[PDB]
Design a protein around this ligand. Structure first.
Ligand code: A4N
Ligand code: A4N
Length: 324
């Protein structure tokens, strides 16, 4: 395959000391698990169990993410990234790291966010609200990309919103990675509906632009009231669902540009599809959230060619946000 590199923040990690990005050498230091009393179960993650807790030293509510330690290196990576990004705009704050003495189980302690229901948000958000929150996510992405980090798991479940306080936090940094130009990354990242075409065609030299694809998927779902927007039933079918909207000609152009070899499993499912018009998704139930600026913005995120997508900084300058 033809090599590629990010159009922005390309060399941020190259020009930083090894300590910043070498998470395997990061020294983790435990806090006191006895400072925290678990209150109730919140949600159960693929790699974790989440609880609401009280920090008994200051009477503050926190969230405790108990991690089943399947892989030690992965935990160190999440911790290092959270420490690096701590205090960034709209980045979840890691408050502490604790261990359960008897079971030797690690847990991450975060600032508590009173999360508005996804279904509730879908029903009541206004056109202005969608622009406001999309801009808040962009602040988080432009910051983490500027810090040489790709989130790689951008999706609604990883975006906590306290609608009452208009507060947004990008969470679950468990799949996040440091961007090093020329590096070949594992394509088995992100959640199916949000996986960029680069991951689906097994193009390993991807970058921050993967997060911009995921963000486009979110925007498309909310403005069109179609969740998820690209409803794949498996990783191969996910590429067909995208191909049904963006057409198959630009898919081959993208494959040819980077000399990508398509897996044989695509041969009998991919087919031939025309490029569709974003206006075809407009209906009576979603027209109050769609505008020419929204469609132009979406068209600039949802592109096969990862290099052609708006960067988070370019996205922040789009007319869709002139009202925020
Ligand atoms: C249950 C657990 C799992 C992983 C890390 C820490 C803990 C833990 C153990 C004891 C206490 C004290 N009430 C608190 C926690 Cl979070
Ligand atoms: C998908 C989307 C797009 C634009 C604005 C808000 C949202 C949104 C909806 C629900 C949730 C669930 N915690 C998160 C977000 Cl960012």
């Amino acid at each position: 395959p033809v090599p590629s590199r990010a159009r922005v923040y390309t060399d941020v990690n190259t020009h930083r000391p090894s300590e910043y990005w070498d998470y395997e050498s990061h020294v983790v230091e435990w806090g006191n698990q006895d400072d925290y009393q678990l209150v109730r179960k919140l949600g159960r993650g693929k790699y974790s169990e989440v609880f609401e807790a009280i920090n008994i030293t200051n009477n503050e509510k926190v969230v405790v993410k108990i991690l089943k330690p399947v892989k030690k290196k992965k935990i160190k990576r999440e911790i290092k990234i959270l420490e690096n990004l701590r205090g960034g705009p709209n980045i979840i704050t890691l408050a502490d790291i604790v261990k359960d003495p008897v079971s030797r189980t690690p847990a991450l302690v975060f600032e508590h966010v009173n999360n508005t229901d996804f279904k509730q948000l879908y029903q009541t958000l206004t056109d202005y609200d969608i622009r406001f929150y999309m801009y808040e996510i962009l602040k988080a992405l432009d910051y983490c990309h500027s810090m040489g980090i790709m989130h790689r798991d951008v999706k609604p479940h990883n975006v906590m919103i306290d609608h009452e306080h208009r507060k947004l936090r990008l969470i679950d940094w468990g799949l996040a990675e440091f961007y090093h130009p020329g590096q070949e990354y594992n394509v088995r990242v992100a959640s199916r509906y949000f996986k960029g075409p680069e991951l689906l065609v097994d193009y390993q030299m991807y970058d921050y632009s993967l997060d911009m694809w995921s963000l486009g998927c979110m925007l498309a779902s909310m403005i069109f009231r179609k969740e998820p927007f690209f409803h794949g039933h498996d990783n191969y079918d996910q590429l067909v669902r995208i191909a049904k909207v963006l057409g198959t000609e630009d898919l081959y152009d993208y494959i040819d540009k980077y000399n990508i070899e398509l897996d044989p499993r695509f041969n009998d499912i991919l087919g031939r599809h025309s490029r569709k018009r974003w206006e075809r998704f407009v209906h009576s139930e979603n027209q109050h959230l769609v505008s020419p600026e929204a469609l132009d913005f979406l068209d600039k995120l949802l592109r096969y060619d990862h290099q052609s997508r708006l960067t988070a900084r370019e996205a922040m300058e789009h007319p869709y946000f002139y009202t925020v």
